[PDB]
Ligand SMILES: CC(C)CCC[C@@H](C)[C@H]1CC[C@H]2[C@@H]3CC=C4C[C@@H](O)CC[C@]4(C)[C@H]3CC[C@]12C
Ligand SMILES: CC(C)CCC[C@@H](C)[C@H]1CC[C@H]2[C@@H]3CC=C4C[C@@H](O)CC[C@]4(C)[C@H]3CC[C@]12C
């Protein structure tokens with residue numbers, strides 16, 4: 007029955023041909039860092055995606071920094087029932103969270119974003135996943151606060167009891183009110199993230215604009231820091 | 245107008261529950277007491293399939309009981325020869341986030357889908373011998389959770405938009421749409437005759453649907469948590485479900501209610517997959533705690549346990565001939581148990 | 583007193599137990615095996631076990647019996663094995679520190695890809711073979727004794743009695759070169775790598791503390807870990823390798839008791855290594871707990 | 877609003893569901909037992925087959 011031997015040879019050569027391709031794909035898979043992009047539709051998430059590029063449920067994007075490949079997947083076009091498909095991204099290096107910091111006085115979109123951040127951070131399957139929090143639309147926030155018509159003092163009553171941290175590093179010429187509002191918004195999310203106190207994952211807030219070209223560098227630095235902190239915690243260095 | 249209809253809904257629930265209670269005089273446990281127990285089922289790893297780069301989330305058995313298809317989140321849809329362990333094919337998916345895969349009963353086609361909201365049909369044995377996307381069944385507004393072939397031209401799919409659909413593959417359009425589910429639909433199961441299929445959903449209810457007539461015959465609400473898995477009893481008169489409730493429930497279409505439950509004090513995690521042996525006596529289910537518990541379908545006692553996986557067991561499937569049961573896990577390996 | 587027999591035997595037993603536990607935990611835990619970083623730790627554990635089985639017992643026999651009975655050829659073989667395994671363990675520690683520094687500071691984002699099997703094999707080959715060129719090649723040919731042969735004869739016997747014992751003496755060139763190759767260069771590399779790791783950990787902890795203060799509802803851990811590791815390494819080896827540098831330059835006047843104490847301080851390193859690089863690692867602690875659960 | 881239409885469809889579907897014929901639970905259990913016993917002899921997992929017949933040896 008030489009037919010058995012011929013079929014065995016064919017099966018093994020096919021197996022080796024497939025195995026070499028799998029090995030080749032393995033190097034690119036490990037060399038790449040996967041990212042999950044989240045945020046409300048009205049946020050500047052789409053503009054950030056467009057900048058990094060320059061009706062499916064997943065819009066994947068390809069971008070490289072310092073010869074490091076990053077695969078970001080916008081989960082847009084998905085329904086608000088997030089508790090199921092979110093489990094798929096438990097192994098992503100970081101979750102990029104985009105929030106319109108200027109949308110505090112719109113519905114209460116900022117409060118909804120805070121609740122979403124709480125739910126994602128406290129998610130059972132995302133315990134070891136860090137979050138890159140992009141506080142987007144900073145220019146709009148500055149425009150709205152500088153005008154003086156903003157009533158943020160009672161939309162978030164804790165603001166009146168809040169003052170700029172001593173560690174703040176405002177940009178040159180930045181108005182004191184703009185800095186105070188920015189850091190209040192940032193601390194609102196930091197309160198949610200800091201509550202864990204476990205160190206398995208960390209939040210990396212940033213003050214970014216929708217067309218900010220450095221957002222790619224922010225993502226690269228955040229991924230590098232996340233990996234460094236994971237390694238340090240592995241060796242009891244954190 | 246609206247108020248009367250809502251009260252009628254509660255009255256309808258009341259009569260349905262009263263009838264279901266009246267149909268219950270004894271439980272399956274009570275009648276099964278005198279039957280000889282199955283005993284301790286012994287099974288250990290038989291074949292280890294390697295090659296998937298990322299966590300495996302779905303698999304299916306071919307009707308020949310030799311060819312096996314599995315899908316991984318890395319974007320690789322691999323077809324394995326279970327007897328020889330050789331990888332027949334390694335299909336590169338357009339979208340890496342595949343959540344379901346299916347193998348046609350004749351073996352000519354393979355289906356897969358996930359967060360891409362598209363079910364991709366692959367022709368395995370075209371005259372050129374190259375695997376290619378025959379057609380894309382777009383139209384769903386949610387991630388595809390499960391899919392199963394009715395034939396080479398028909399396939400039923402479940403999606404995150406709370407609706408299941410029957411697709412005519414050649415035309416690429418929904419022959420029929422199922423919208424009775426209120427929550428996310430997670431799993432599908434075809435009846436042996438293919439005349440009926442039952443879909444579990446995150447609304448904790450299981451619904452029995454008619455393929456040709458496009459309506460749900462019955463609704464089962466025994467579970468109180470998201471249903472992740474569902475499978476018919478081999479005769480087609482009953483089905484079992486898996487859910488995050490950390491318990492399995494068996495339902496009979498004719499009884500129109502839960503028959504019996506499978507649970508233990510040492511299990512607290514959710515259930516990912518469920519399957520039945522050829523005779524239906526053994527109920528095999530995958531659990532989030534990295535092992536699969538084998539349950540006596542009649543007694544609901546732990547007849548055996550499969551623990552050859554280092555991560556979440558995402559999928560489970562028994563061969564049509566009953567020779568072996570394959571299990572996938574997030575550890576990127578398939579373990580075949582006999 | 584014969585109490586030293588209990589102490590040396592206990593040290594040997596603890597070292598062997600620790601190394602065997604490390605190796606079996608790595609082997610059983612298939613999730614540890616997939617990480618190439620664990621390969622360096624496995625090699626270090628094997629080297630320490632080899633020390634504890636082929637070097638420590640022979641030194642203990644030499645001490646308790648105070649006499650060598652296996653001949654000068656096996657004296658040379660024992661000295662070469664001691665030097666080889668000691669330098670292999672030191673090089674394993676240095677390579678572990680360098681790999682950790684690489685992963686943390688140099689290539690954190692592509693560490694997994696850069697750690698190809700070729701790199702791991704080359705590093706382990708450097709750790710295991712380079713000691714051969716300084717342990718067996720010079721000692722078997724007697725290059726360490728040339729120029730001080732007359733002094734060795736005086737030190738060879740305590741001729742007031744008929745006792746004879748195996749000896750190891752080094753001339754100025756061999757002493758300096760071997761000390762530099764085995765301890766000082768690896769010590770400097772470890773110091774630099776761990777200082778850079780400390781700087782990275784300090785900046786990360788400062789950022790974490792700033793964020794925690796910002797999120798408050800009203801940094802020294804890396805220092806402690808690195809201090810523990812480097813203090814253990816220094817207390818184990820620096821005294822011996824400083825004596826070896828100064829011993830030839832003072833007409834070999836160092837008393838034998840100090841030499842033995844420093845030699846066994848060096849040996850203790852192999853017993854401490856299982857409890858330093860595995861205990862201070864989250865994955866190894868998880869594996870050890872799993873094994874203890876049985 | 878679509879609430880009225882949704883309620884009407886819901887009541888129609890529940891009315892369809894209620895009208896089905898339901899058979900005794902003990903009868904269903906007996907049928908399942910009959911199927912299990914009739915095929916227990918042909919279930920390799922329930923009763924392991926000998927090594928010679930098993931294709932995985
Ligand atoms: C559990 C296994 C897979 C861990 C693998 C770690 C590898 C790197 C370890 C395990 C056994 C080790 C080998 C054991 C024996 C020796 C003999 C020694 O004279 C030279 C090094 C050498 C050849 C070691 C090299 C490194 C080694 C191969
Ligand atoms: C990593 C590499 C450099 C390790 C190898 C170091 C080698 C080259 C060193 C270690 C011991 C050294 C020898 C030690 C003793 C002496 C006696 C001296 O009168 C002439 C040189 C000579 C013969 C040295 C030659 C170089 C030597 C063999």
Ligand SMILES: CC(C)CCC[C@@H](C)[C@H]1CC[C@H]2[C@@H]3CC=C4C[C@@H](O)CC[C@]4(C)[C@H]3CC[C@]12C
Nearest residue numbers: 765766769773774777812816819820821823824
């Ligand atoms: C072999 C014997 C002499 C080793 C004794 C350990 C000495 C050399 C070690 C212990 C602590 C170490 C210091 C700790 C950290 C610093 C800060 C920075 O400036 C780098 C070097 C420096 C200054 C190190 C130099 C070497 C050092 C002083």
Ligand SMILES: CC(C)CCC[C@@H](C)[C@H]1CC[C@H]2[C@@H]3CC=C4C[C@@H](O)CC[C@]4(C)[C@H]3CC[C@]12C
Nearest residue numbers: 816817820821824825828829832835836837840
């Ligand atoms: C990490 C290291 C630097 C710690 C210090 C090591 C010390 C304990 C070592 C280094 C040099 C050694 C000295 C070398 C020379 C002699 C002369 C001898 O007649 C008595 C012992 C004595 C005095 C040694 C004592 C121990 C010693 C001082």
Ligand SMILES: CCCCCCCCCCCCCCCC(=O)O
Nearest residue numbers: 621699702703704706707708710711
């Ligand atoms: C004389 C020094 C020799 C050093 C040899 C180094 C060997 C490196 C091996 C890298 C990891 C190999 C893992 C698979 C081992 C196996 O096949 O069992």
Ligand SMILES: CCCCCCCCCCCCCCCC(=O)O
Nearest residue numbers: 773776777780802804805808809812
């Ligand atoms: C061992 C070589 C590398 C260096 C690593 C150890 C660094 C030791 C630093 C000592 C000073 C620590 C001061 C801490 C003060 C505090 O607790 O706030």
Ligand SMILES: NCCc1c[nH]c2ccc(O)cc12
Nearest residue numbers: 664665668669752760761764
């Ligand atoms: N017991 C220490 C053996 C040893 C390792 N390396 C050495 C270098 C020089 C020396 O004399 C001795 C050694």
